[PDB]
Amino acid sequence: IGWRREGIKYRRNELFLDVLESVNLLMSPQGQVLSAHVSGRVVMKSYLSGMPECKFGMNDKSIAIDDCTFHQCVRLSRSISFIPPDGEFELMRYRTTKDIILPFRVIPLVREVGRTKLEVKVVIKSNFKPSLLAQKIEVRIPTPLNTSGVQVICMKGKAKYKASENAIVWKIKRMAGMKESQISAEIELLPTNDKKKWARPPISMNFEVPFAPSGLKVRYLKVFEPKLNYSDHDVIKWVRYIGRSGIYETRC
């Protein structure tokens, strides 16, 4: 054991686990999931007395883990066992594909109005417990290059046209589970080389949510240290879940 020295003490024996996940989606205009996956890591912050034998347990085999590497300290069989390094460290890393919760659904509508206007309406739907708040929401809607001007109306949030980036950017501070919001935009067009079709790129989203899209859930973290005169009941334990978008594109 060259990751942990030997004579460590704390009055207050406490650990913290952070489940951190990226959720990636590509969706067809109809509503097919063309591709989706989740990448995750568990980080541990441990203030435990001595040299303890810990046993981590989650709802494995219930969700399905395609593959996962571990940290040196991990003894391999068939559940997870280790003596943690003190302070903060990455315990495991993992990937997921099956039975993913997709926190948001995006429904685009587009209509051409002669050669002069584009009519665009996008709806977002939150798909998770109403107890829970998504935050830092962005919806990115692309605009053509012959764009003269853009009008938006949105009842929730704020939105501005970013001519430099060729995109309408809609931002929302917080939104609760099982809910609906929509933006309307009218895009004014300059005339153009006639046989330019618009390659309508996807509408993309960013968001953060307080749960693991993978479905993963922490079940126990058991600490035993045989010499010293604390037990398991004496340790204070916490989890938090932080789920964030990676590539989250819906094709309009």
């Binding site: 913290f16 307080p210 922490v218 079940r219 126990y220 973290l221 334990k237 916490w238 989890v239 938090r240």
Partner: peptide
């Protein structure tokens, strides 16, 4: 948000 396990 840092909650106990159960």
């Amino acid at each position: 948000s840092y909650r106990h396990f159960a």
